[PDB]
Design a protein around this ligand. Structure first.
Ligand code: CA
Ligand code: CA
Ligand code: NI
Lengths: 419, 416
């Protein structure tokens, strides 16, 4: 194990083994600033930036002064590793530098309870992949049937689409049920009204570090050098609006009304201890998508739902990121194979995370099986899709011996449509 | 009219006055300028000349490296800026004409300026509003009987595009590598795209946005449309075909999308507005508007290949061939609460008229490579060859003057 001079509860999401990056502000200071979570506190990086005396950061301390993590993300792995090593030393229970500097320590730390979290970065482009095999299979069965579940290209490339960047909001942001066009009756023209099949989608997403030049693909051998860290994501969906609009150009308004992400970006370095061998792929992908480097992660995911009249939230999904068929390396490589330029701060999501066990399906569309099964949310109460006032909270964590690497919350409450 | 000499056939008379971002050899810093004649009026140099109610306390927007903040100010600010510019360029407010010291610092020639992207595009969206285009593609994919999909006549279908790869006119475009499936009975192959194509489009920039969760009523849609630019949505058809179902165009589009530098203000385009195309069935009330918002903009596309001395005009079309208006597109885009932001770019989708000479893509012009396009000098084309340069131009014809868009050019580089 390892210990910080800052007290850390055994089940805390933020032990010294984690050290996630976030943007926060406080009642005392409205300026959004970069911080690192440790225990129940936040270490203000702008206050201690002068302590980053290493080669990679000494002339780049200004990145810790920014209102977003973009510049830090754009520095690259040498900088990330140096920052992490510095923080591990400084927060160490045996290191005196910060521990014994009473005045520095006083203005460098703030309680997480006092902080308002903001989006970690300015996202230039958001991309949603569709890499969970059971998810695509489930949707396939409902749409086409048991026999033609997966479409021809699924096993050959990590299919994905460009999402809406503007509507990616931080955990805690209320999400209003969307108005739009839908076609409930095929024998009648479409109608305008409030979404009737509001859903959540359990996902995880990673931020891009240094980008690639316009026109220059990122070789899969170098893909890992561009992955900064991860966050939890709830890709809120309006299924009825989506179904009517999506053919042939893809998900659009049924997705863009809101997408929530957790605030704390857990660095890839903190997740490496939980890496496991990649799933066997058959057919074997083309050479450009082939890599031996293990890059599949054992991250326990959970989703709870709490109706406005409920006192206790019901856990409706227990899944794991290790189910994913295509890795983040294959996704990033594929995303740049044509020359597309990924940039620092870009966000690439996994797609709904569903395992084979029905208990691990990552969307109410799957859990209620298209509204044909009731989801048990605690006696006297059931659900098919989201009701106004419902709060959905996604959490996740890696379990180590005597410690865990957690992500904090990815929450949102449904507000009534303007109807 | 204007103290700056303006050739009659100029794209930039005093009736145009587009906004753009430029830099020069003497000053590499991207700054805002307005095209007039063959010159550029540096707005950062004359920012103090905007003394009106809407701009006097916001002159800083003309000091920015992008037009976002100016776009974000809204219509009252845009109208005032235009009026100030028109008065200054006519000597009615003789400050600029007579102040030699200022004047010599305010103007620079377009020929020696380096143009940049007009704004930082937070989100790019590509609509599919040209009926003949959708119909042609439908005929090629499904057949005439199932040309248009069920939802086409009911809503302005569109998809989120890739913002990062939107490049300014003149940027070389690399033929993309990717996966293709030339033989459905065999696995996909990896290689250089073989069906490289262009797509004639026009796009508008968003002004003030709307708050997250708050739709923009169609009645107010016109208040959020800043101006327009030409666009070439480069496409790798064979890569696109294999990847697009069911999530949409992806790598077949994101390797590059070119736009012209000069943003023509909507106010400059109003004199060329024409009646909106009759829609049957009539759209749902939220998409209804009687205000005419269809525009007569002549568009032209040329192609010049390696070894060819002259470019051949392969397409002559018009922006008036759009079934769904920009007002309906903007409204539909925010109906669910999605927050449009200053600088966002919403494109029309490939523009095609009913006449084959007006089809906006080589996919259509060569009808899926079944017809050879005559590009002159004894040469033909189905799809783009390495070395081919495509240049899109556009203009509105007024009485004695024309509102032009400059160029939206790009040359194809061999695959890496
Ligand atoms: Ca999704
Ligand atoms: Ca297009
Ligand atoms: Ni130990």
């Amino acid at each position: 194990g390892s210990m910080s001079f800052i007290p850390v509860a055994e089940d805390s999401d933020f032990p010294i083994q984690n050290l996630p990056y976030g943007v926060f502000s406080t009642q005392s200071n409205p300026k959004p600033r970069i911080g690192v979570a440790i225990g129940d506190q936040i270490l203000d990086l702008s206050v201690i930036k002068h302590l980053f005396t290493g080669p990679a950061l000494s002339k780049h301390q200004h990145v810790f002064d920014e209102t977003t993590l973009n510049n830090f993300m754009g520095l690259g792995q040498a900088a990330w590793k140096e920052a992490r090593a510095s923080l591990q030393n400084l927060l160490s229970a045996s290191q005196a530098r910060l521990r014994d500097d009473k005045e520095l320590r006083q203005r460098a730390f703030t309680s997480q309870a006092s902080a308002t979290m903001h989006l970690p970065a300015t996202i230039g482009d958001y991309t949603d992949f569709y890499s969970s095999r059971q998810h695509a299979t489930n949707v396939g069965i409902m749409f086409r049937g048991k026999e033609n579940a997966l479409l021809p290209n699924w096993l050959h490339l990590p299919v994905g689409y460009h999402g809406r960047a503007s509507s990616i909001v931080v955990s805690g942001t209320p999400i209003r049920r969307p108005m739009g066009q839908m076609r409930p009756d095929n024998s009648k023209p479409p109608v305008y009204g409030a979404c009737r099949l509001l859903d959540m989608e359990l996902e995880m997403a990673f931020f891009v570090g240094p980008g690639n030049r316009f026109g220059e693909p990122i070789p899969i051998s170098k893909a890992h050098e561009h992955i900064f860290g991860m966050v939890l994501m709830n890709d809120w969906s309006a299924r009825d609006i989506q179904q009517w609009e999506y053919v042939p150009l893809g998900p659009f308004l049924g997705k863009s009304f809101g997408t929530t992400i957790s605030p704390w970006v857990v660095p890839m370095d903190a997740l490496m201890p939980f890496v496991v061998p990649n799933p066997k792929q058959d057919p074997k992908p083309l050479p450009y998508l082939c890599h031996s480097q293990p890059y599949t992660f054992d991250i326990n995911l959970s989703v709870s739902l709490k109706g406005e009249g409920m006192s206790q939230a019901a856990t409706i999904c227990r899944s794991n990121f290790k189910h994913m068929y295509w890795t983040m390396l294959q996704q990033l490589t594929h995303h740049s194979v044509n020359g597309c330029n990924l940039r620092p701060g870009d966000l690439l999501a996994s797609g709904t995370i569903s395992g084979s066990d029905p208990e691990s399906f990552g969307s109410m569309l799957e859990l209620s099986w298209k509204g044909t099964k009731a989801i048990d949310v605690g006696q006297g109460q059931t659900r098919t899709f989201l009701l106004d006032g419902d709060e959905v909270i996604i959490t996740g964590h890696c379990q180590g011996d005597g410690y865990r690497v957690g992500f904090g919350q990815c929450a949102g409450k449904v507000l009534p449509a303007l109807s």
